[PDB]
Amino acid sequence: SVYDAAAQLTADVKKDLRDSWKVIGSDKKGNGVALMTTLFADNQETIGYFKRLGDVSQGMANDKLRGHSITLMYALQNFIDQLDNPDDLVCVVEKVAVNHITRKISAAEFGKINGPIKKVLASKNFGDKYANAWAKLVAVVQAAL
Amino acid sequence: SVYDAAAQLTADVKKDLRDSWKVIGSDKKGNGVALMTTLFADNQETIGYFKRLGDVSQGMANDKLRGHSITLMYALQNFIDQLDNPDDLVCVVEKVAVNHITRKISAAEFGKINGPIKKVLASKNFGDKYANAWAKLVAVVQAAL
Ligand code: HEM
Ligand code: HEM
């Protein structure tokens, strides 16, 4: 269950999540857009899903993409803040899950975000240990998809 | 015009928004649910729009309502954090606007949130001065609906 996946996040994992978020979460506009642009660059097959955003190749100049990217970073902020209470983490995770289920996004497709996250983390010198921690958090959402 | 509305956020208004947010934003779960339950209580005609959340009268005990409420508070956190740059504030406001336009929510009905905000602020000892400040921020979203 989603609860099982959340309850499985250890103190060490939460520590790495919080430490890395202190940095990548400090520039939501910059890192948020970087995350989306990396997703489109390495997984071009996902571009079609974001037609509402218009031409995503415009990057920062695209107001719809910028608004989307910043908002996505607050969803992650939400997750990070609820880490110590699995009950609260689960209900916010399920909220995000529903928004993607309605778009026909499978658990496997949702996991495509791990690549971009790893690269963005690496840009700030956060290695594999941190990428693995984030994959565990993403896995919590996948449990609901 | 969302841009003209955003221009109404003067130095004094922004200060009042930040000062009051430091208090109400400290407990997103509690105040988030308080806002929603107040909305449903004072404006029963809006409950129909929230069919997905199930029995909203259950308040905090309703997992979907709690998840929804916390997420809403992060939308406000988003707005507050973008007060420095009007171009960024506008793109995140339009993002939220789209989510309501699709649910057929008009500017007039969106404005029904002012009552709840006024009451929640009042319970924390923040009077009309602050309620009016928030009314102006809500007005920015209304301009995009
Ligand atoms: C870190 C993981 C992710 C998070 C936290 C996340 C978060 C979000 C949020 C908050 C929204 C806005 C929901 C709304 O207002 O309707 C959104 C929309 C969306 N997401 Fe994700 N997402 C993630 C990964 C993905 C991935 C990997 C895909 C695709 C393979 C995806 C596809 C979509 C689509 C299609 C939309 C709708 C965009 C639109 O039309 O406005 N998401 N996501
Ligand atoms: C401070 C004002 C408000 C803010 C910042 C706000 C923010 C949000 C956010 C972020 C969501 C989640 C979007 C999603 O993931 O689909 C949402 C959903 C929604 N909002 Fe609002 N909202 C506000 C006022 C209102 C009002 C006054 C109404 C109606 C009278 C309304 C009706 C809805 C509905 C119907 C949903 C969909 C709920 C669901 O089915 O899950 N909102 N709102």
Coordinates of C-alpha atoms and ligand atoms in Angstrom, one line a residue:
Chain A
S1 CA 0.0 0.0 0.0
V2 CA 1.0 3.7 -0.2
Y3 CA 1.1 3.7 3.6
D4 CA 3.6 0.9 3.6
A5 CA 5.8 2.7 1.1
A6 CA 5.7 5.9 3.2
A7 CA 6.2 4.2 6.6
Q8 CA 9.3 2.6 4.9
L9 CA 11.1 5.9 4.6
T10 CA 13.9 5.7 7.2
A11 CA 15.5 8.5 9.3
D12 CA 18.6 8.4 7.1
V13 CA 16.5 8.6 3.9
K14 CA 14.5 11.6 5.3
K15 CA 17.8 13.2 6.3
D16 CA 19.2 13.0 2.8
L17 CA 15.9 14.2 1.3
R18 CA 15.8 17.3 3.6
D19 CA 19.5 18.1 3.1
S20 CA 19.3 18.0 -0.7
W21 CA 15.9 19.8 -0.8
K22 CA 17.4 22.7 1.3
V23 CA 19.4 23.3 -1.9
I24 CA 17.4 22.3 -4.9
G25 CA 14.3 23.7 -3.3
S26 CA 15.9 27.1 -2.7
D27 CA 15.4 28.0 -6.4
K28 CA 12.1 26.5 -7.4
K29 CA 11.8 28.5 -10.6
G30 CA 15.3 27.7 -11.8
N31 CA 15.4 24.0 -10.8
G32 CA 11.8 23.4 -11.6
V33 CA 12.2 24.4 -15.2
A34 CA 15.5 22.5 -15.4
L35 CA 13.7 19.4 -14.3
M36 CA 11.0 19.7 -16.9
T37 CA 13.4 20.6 -19.7
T38 CA 15.5 17.7 -18.8
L39 CA 12.5 15.4 -18.9
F40 CA 11.6 16.6 -22.4
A41 CA 15.2 16.3 -23.6
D42 CA 15.8 12.7 -22.4
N43 CA 12.2 11.5 -22.9
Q44 CA 10.8 13.2 -25.9
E45 CA 7.9 10.8 -26.0
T46 CA 6.4 12.6 -23.0
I47 CA 6.2 16.0 -24.8
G48 CA 2.7 15.2 -26.1
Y49 CA 1.2 14.9 -22.6
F50 CA 2.0 18.6 -22.0
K51 CA 0.2 20.1 -25.0
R52 CA -1.6 22.6 -22.7
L53 CA 1.8 24.2 -22.0
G54 CA 2.3 25.0 -25.7
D55 CA 5.9 25.1 -27.1
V56 CA 7.9 23.7 -24.2
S57 CA 11.2 24.3 -26.1
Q58 CA 10.8 28.0 -25.2
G59 CA 11.9 27.1 -21.6
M60 CA 11.9 29.9 -19.1
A61 CA 10.2 32.2 -21.6
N62 CA 7.1 30.1 -21.7
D63 CA 4.9 31.4 -18.9
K64 CA 2.7 28.3 -18.9
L65 CA 5.7 26.1 -18.5
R66 CA 7.2 28.4 -15.8
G67 CA 3.9 28.4 -13.9
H68 CA 3.7 24.6 -14.1
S69 CA 7.3 24.1 -13.1
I70 CA 7.1 26.3 -10.0
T71 CA 3.9 24.6 -8.9
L72 CA 5.5 21.2 -9.3
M73 CA 8.2 22.3 -6.9
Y74 CA 5.6 23.2 -4.3
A75 CA 4.2 19.7 -4.6
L76 CA 7.6 18.4 -3.7
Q77 CA 7.9 21.0 -0.9
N78 CA 4.6 19.6 0.3
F79 CA 5.9 16.0 0.4
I80 CA 9.1 17.0 2.1
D81 CA 7.2 18.8 4.8
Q82 CA 5.0 15.8 5.6
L83 CA 7.8 13.3 5.9
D84 CA 7.4 12.8 9.6
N85 CA 3.7 12.0 9.5
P86 CA 3.0 9.1 7.0
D87 CA -0.8 9.8 7.4
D88 CA -0.4 13.3 6.0
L89 CA 2.2 12.3 3.4
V90 CA -0.2 9.6 2.1
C91 CA -3.2 11.9 1.7
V92 CA -1.2 14.6 -0.2
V93 CA 0.5 11.9 -2.3
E94 CA -2.8 10.4 -3.3
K95 CA -3.9 13.9 -4.3
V96 CA -1.0 14.2 -6.7
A97 CA -1.7 10.6 -7.9
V98 CA -5.3 11.3 -8.9
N99 CA -4.2 14.3 -11.0
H100 CA -1.9 11.9 -13.0
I101 CA -4.3 8.9 -13.1
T102 CA -6.8 11.2 -14.8
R103 CA -4.1 11.9 -17.5
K104 CA -3.5 8.2 -18.0
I105 CA 0.0 8.3 -16.5
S106 CA 1.2 4.8 -15.4
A107 CA 3.5 4.1 -12.5
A108 CA 6.2 3.2 -14.9
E109 CA 5.8 6.5 -16.9
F110 CA 5.8 8.5 -13.6
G111 CA 9.1 6.9 -12.7
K112 CA 10.7 8.5 -15.8
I113 CA 11.2 11.6 -13.6
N114 CA 14.0 9.8 -11.7
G115 CA 16.5 10.4 -14.5
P116 CA 15.9 14.2 -14.5
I117 CA 16.0 14.4 -10.7
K118 CA 19.3 12.5 -10.6
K119 CA 20.8 15.0 -13.2
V120 CA 19.5 18.1 -11.3
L121 CA 20.9 16.7 -8.1
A122 CA 24.2 16.0 -9.7
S123 CA 24.4 19.6 -11.0
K124 CA 24.5 20.6 -7.3
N125 CA 27.0 17.9 -6.4
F126 CA 24.5 15.5 -4.8
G127 CA 25.5 12.0 -5.7
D128 CA 23.9 8.6 -6.2
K129 CA 23.0 8.2 -2.5
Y130 CA 20.8 11.2 -2.8
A131 CA 19.3 10.1 -6.1
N132 CA 18.4 6.8 -4.5
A133 CA 16.7 8.6 -1.7
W134 CA 14.6 10.6 -4.1
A135 CA 13.7 7.4 -6.0
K136 CA 12.3 6.1 -2.8
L137 CA 10.0 9.1 -2.4
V138 CA 8.9 8.8 -6.0
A139 CA 8.2 5.2 -5.3
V140 CA 5.6 6.3 -2.7
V141 CA 3.7 8.1 -5.5
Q142 CA 4.1 5.0 -7.7
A143 CA 2.4 2.9 -5.1
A144 CA -0.7 4.9 -5.7
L145 CA -0.6 4.6 -9.5
Chain B
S1 CA -6.6 42.3 -16.3
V2 CA -4.5 40.1 -14.1
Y3 CA -1.6 42.4 -14.6
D4 CA -3.5 45.5 -13.4
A5 CA -4.8 43.5 -10.4
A6 CA -1.3 42.4 -9.6
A7 CA -0.2 46.0 -9.6
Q8 CA -2.6 46.7 -6.8
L9 CA -0.3 44.7 -4.5
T10 CA 1.5 47.7 -3.0
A11 CA 4.3 47.7 -0.5
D12 CA 1.9 48.0 2.5
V13 CA -0.4 45.2 1.1
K14 CA 2.5 42.8 0.6
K15 CA 3.8 43.5 4.1
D16 CA 0.4 42.7 5.7
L17 CA 0.1 39.5 3.6
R18 CA 3.6 38.3 4.7
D19 CA 3.0 39.2 8.4
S20 CA -0.3 37.4 8.6
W21 CA 0.9 34.4 6.5
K22 CA 3.7 33.8 9.0
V23 CA 1.0 32.9 11.5
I24 CA -1.7 31.2 9.4
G25 CA 0.8 29.4 7.2
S26 CA 2.5 27.8 10.2
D27 CA -0.3 25.3 10.5
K28 CA -1.4 24.4 7.0
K29 CA -3.3 21.3 8.0
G30 CA -5.3 22.9 10.7
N31 CA -6.0 26.3 9.0
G32 CA -6.4 24.7 5.6
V33 CA -9.2 22.5 6.9
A34 CA -10.7 25.4 8.9
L35 CA -10.9 27.4 5.7
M36 CA -12.7 24.7 3.8
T37 CA -15.1 23.7 6.6
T38 CA -16.0 27.4 7.0
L39 CA -16.6 27.7 3.2
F40 CA -19.0 24.7 3.2
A41 CA -20.7 25.9 6.4
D42 CA -21.4 29.5 5.2
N43 CA -21.9 28.7 1.6
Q44 CA -23.6 25.3 1.3
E45 CA -24.3 25.9 -2.4
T46 CA -20.7 25.3 -3.1
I47 CA -20.5 21.8 -1.7
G48 CA -21.7 20.3 -4.9
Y49 CA -18.4 21.2 -6.7
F50 CA -16.5 19.1 -4.2
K51 CA -18.2 15.7 -5.0
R52 CA -14.8 13.9 -5.3
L53 CA -13.9 14.6 -1.7
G54 CA -16.9 12.6 -0.4
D55 CA -18.5 13.6 2.9
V56 CA -16.9 17.0 3.6
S57 CA -18.8 17.3 6.9
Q58 CA -16.4 14.8 8.4
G59 CA -13.7 17.6 8.3
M60 CA -10.3 16.5 9.5
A61 CA -11.4 12.9 9.5
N62 CA -11.8 12.9 5.8
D63 CA -8.5 12.0 4.2
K64 CA -9.4 13.4 0.8
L65 CA -10.5 16.7 2.3
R66 CA -7.3 16.9 4.4
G67 CA -5.1 16.2 1.4
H68 CA -7.0 18.8 -0.6
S69 CA -6.8 21.4 2.2
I70 CA -3.0 21.0 2.8
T71 CA -2.4 21.3 -1.0
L72 CA -4.5 24.5 -1.1
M73 CA -2.3 26.1 1.6
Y74 CA 0.7 25.4 -0.5
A75 CA -0.9 27.3 -3.4
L76 CA -1.1 30.3 -1.1
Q77 CA 2.5 29.7 0.0
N78 CA 3.3 29.8 -3.7
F79 CA 1.5 33.1 -4.2
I80 CA 3.3 34.7 -1.2
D81 CA 6.7 33.6 -2.3
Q82 CA 6.1 35.2 -5.8
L83 CA 5.1 38.6 -4.5
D84 CA 8.6 40.0 -5.4
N85 CA 8.2 39.3 -9.1
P86 CA 4.8 40.2 -10.7
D87 CA 5.6 38.2 -13.8
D88 CA 6.0 35.0 -11.8
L89 CA 3.0 35.7 -9.6
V90 CA 0.9 36.0 -12.7
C91 CA 2.0 32.7 -14.2
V92 CA 1.3 30.7 -11.0
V93 CA -2.0 32.5 -10.5
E94 CA -3.1 31.6 -14.1
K95 CA -2.1 28.0 -13.4
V96 CA -4.5 27.9 -10.4
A97 CA -7.1 29.8 -12.4
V98 CA -7.1 27.1 -15.1
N99 CA -7.8 24.4 -12.5
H100 CA -11.0 26.3 -11.6
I101 CA -12.1 27.4 -15.0
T102 CA -12.3 23.7 -15.9
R103 CA -14.5 23.1 -12.9
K104 CA -16.8 26.0 -14.2
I105 CA -15.9 28.2 -11.2
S106 CA -16.7 31.9 -11.9
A107 CA -14.9 34.9 -10.4
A108 CA -17.9 35.7 -8.3
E109 CA -18.0 32.2 -6.8
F110 CA -14.3 32.1 -6.3
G111 CA -14.7 35.3 -4.3
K112 CA -16.8 33.4 -1.8
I113 CA -13.5 32.4 -0.2
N114 CA -13.1 35.9 1.2
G115 CA -15.7 35.2 4.0
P116 CA -13.8 32.1 5.3
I117 CA -10.4 33.9 5.1
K118 CA -11.8 36.8 7.1
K119 CA -13.1 34.4 9.8
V120 CA -9.9 32.3 10.0
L121 CA -7.8 35.5 10.2
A122 CA -10.1 36.9 12.9
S123 CA -9.6 33.8 15.0
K124 CA -5.9 34.5 15.0
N125 CA -6.5 38.2 16.0
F126 CA -6.0 39.6 12.5
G127 CA -8.7 42.1 11.7
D128 CA -10.3 43.7 8.6
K129 CA -7.0 45.4 7.6
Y130 CA -5.6 41.9 6.9
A131 CA -8.8 40.5 5.5
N132 CA -8.8 43.4 3.0
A133 CA -5.1 42.7 2.1
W134 CA -6.0 39.1 1.3
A135 CA -9.1 40.1 -0.7
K136 CA -6.7 41.9 -3.0
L137 CA -4.6 38.8 -3.6
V138 CA -7.7 36.8 -4.2
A139 CA -8.7 39.5 -6.7
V140 CA -5.7 38.7 -8.8
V141 CA -7.0 35.1 -9.3
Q142 CA -10.5 36.4 -10.0
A143 CA -9.1 38.6 -12.8
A144 CA -7.9 35.4 -14.5
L145 CA -11.3 33.6 -14.2
Ligands
HEM1 C1 8.4 14.4 -9.2 C2 7.2 13.9 -9.9 C3 6.1 14.6 -10.3 C4 5.4 15.5 -9.6 C5 5.6 15.9 -8.1 C6 4.3 16.0 -10.4 C7 3.5 17.1 -10.1 C8 2.5 17.6 -10.9 C9 1.6 18.7 -10.5 C10 1.5 19.4 -9.2 C11 0.8 18.9 -11.6 C12 -0.4 19.9 -11.7 C13 -1.7 19.2 -11.5 C14 -2.9 20.0 -11.9 O1 -3.0 21.2 -11.4 O2 -3.7 19.5 -12.7 C15 1.2 18.0 -12.6 C16 0.6 17.9 -13.9 C17 0.9 17.0 -14.9 N1 1.9 16.0 -14.8 FE1 3.1 15.7 -13.2 N2 4.4 15.4 -11.7 C18 5.5 14.6 -11.6 C19 5.9 13.7 -12.7 C20 5.2 13.6 -13.9 C21 5.7 12.7 -15.0 C22 7.0 11.9 -15.0 C23 4.8 12.9 -16.0 C24 4.8 12.3 -17.3 C25 5.5 11.1 -17.8 C26 3.8 13.8 -15.6 C27 2.7 14.3 -16.3 C28 1.8 15.3 -16.0 C29 0.8 15.9 -16.8 C30 0.5 15.4 -18.3 C31 0.3 16.9 -16.2 C32 -0.8 17.9 -16.7 C33 -0.1 19.2 -17.3 C34 -1.1 20.2 -17.7 O3 -1.8 19.9 -18.7 O4 -1.3 21.2 -17.1 N3 4.1 14.3 -14.3 N4 2.2 17.2 -12.2
HEM2 C1 -7.9 31.1 -1.8 C2 -8.7 30.5 -2.8 C3 -8.5 29.3 -3.5 C4 -7.3 28.6 -3.8 C5 -5.9 29.2 -3.6 C6 -7.7 27.4 -4.4 C7 -6.7 26.4 -4.7 C8 -7.1 25.1 -5.2 C9 -6.1 24.1 -5.5 C10 -4.6 24.2 -5.5 C11 -6.8 23.0 -5.9 C12 -6.2 21.7 -6.4 C13 -6.3 21.6 -8.0 C14 -6.2 20.2 -8.5 O1 -5.2 19.5 -8.2 O2 -7.1 19.8 -9.2 C15 -8.2 23.4 -5.9 C16 -9.3 22.5 -6.3 C17 -10.6 22.9 -6.4 N1 -11.1 24.2 -6.1 FE1 -10.1 25.7 -5.3 N2 -9.1 27.2 -4.5 C18 -9.6 28.4 -3.9 C19 -11.0 28.7 -3.8 C20 -12.0 27.9 -4.4 C21 -13.4 28.2 -4.3 C22 -14.0 29.4 -3.5 C23 -14.1 27.3 -5.0 C24 -15.5 27.1 -5.2 C25 -16.6 27.9 -4.6 C26 -13.1 26.3 -5.4 C27 -13.4 25.1 -6.1 C28 -12.5 24.1 -6.4 C29 -12.8 22.8 -6.9 C30 -14.2 22.3 -7.3 C31 -11.7 22.0 -6.9 C32 -11.6 20.6 -7.2 C33 -11.6 19.7 -6.0 C34 -11.4 18.2 -6.4 O3 -12.3 17.7 -7.1 O4 -10.4 17.6 -6.0 N3 -11.8 26.7 -5.0 N4 -8.4 24.7 -5.5

